[PDB]
Amino acid sequence: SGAIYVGNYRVVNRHLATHNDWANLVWEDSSRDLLVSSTTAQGCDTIARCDCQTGVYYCSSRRKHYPVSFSKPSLIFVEASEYYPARYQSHLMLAVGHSEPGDCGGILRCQHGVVGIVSTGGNGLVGFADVRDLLWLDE
Numbered sequence: 001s002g003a004i005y006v007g008n009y010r011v012v013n014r015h016l017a018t019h020n021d022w023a024n025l026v027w028e029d030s031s032r033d034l035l036v037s038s039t040t041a042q043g044c045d046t047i048a049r050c051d052c053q054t055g056v057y058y059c060s061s062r063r064k065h066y067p068v069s070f071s072k073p074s075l076i077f078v079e080a081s082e083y084y085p086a087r088y089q090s091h092l093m094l095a096v097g098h099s100e101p102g103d104c105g106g107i108l109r110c111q112h113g114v115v116g117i118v119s120t121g122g123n124g125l126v127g128f129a130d131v132r133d134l135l136w137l138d139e
């Protein structure tokens with residue numbers, strides 16, 4: 001679990017969105033595994049606006065942060081799960097690292113701010129849904 005709170009928005013993995021998230025829906029994209037809902041309380045996370053390929057992510061299944069090198073956002077094949085059929089997930093970045101189901105939502109950060117959130121795992125890889133292209137999150 002985990003979310004990004006920036007301005008009047010809450011960013012979460014679409015497969016983990018709640019009833020309240022869907023009742024206050026702003027934007028969702030099944031191909032990216034992202035959903036943004038509106039909030040009443042103001043958020044203070046900073047979104048990175050960059051092309052960094054190194055950062056640190058929080059891994060809840062180890063209660064640790066790990067430094068990683070990660071790929072640029074791209075369409076990557078993701079195995080079928082109970083939430084989606086087998087498909088290409090877009091705007092996904094992979095790194096070598098630990099990620100098990102409950103790790104989704106863990107933030108990936110570089111020196112400039114929030115880069116994205118954990119969205120996939122398995123086979124010793126961790127995939128992060130990028131949020132750096134969502135320029136409207138700040139306006």
Ligand SMILES: NC(=O)[C@H]1CCCN(C(=O)[C@@H]2CCNc3[nH]ncc32)C1
Nearest residue numbers: 033078081099100101119120121122
């Ligand atoms: N974005 C998606 O389609 C994800 C939907 C939930 C299931 N997915 C996974 O990869 C999980 C997530 C955490 N890591 C992990 N390690 N082994 C399996 C898994 C795919």
Ligand SMILES: [Zn+2]
Nearest residue numbers: 050052110112
């Ligand atoms: Zn950066």
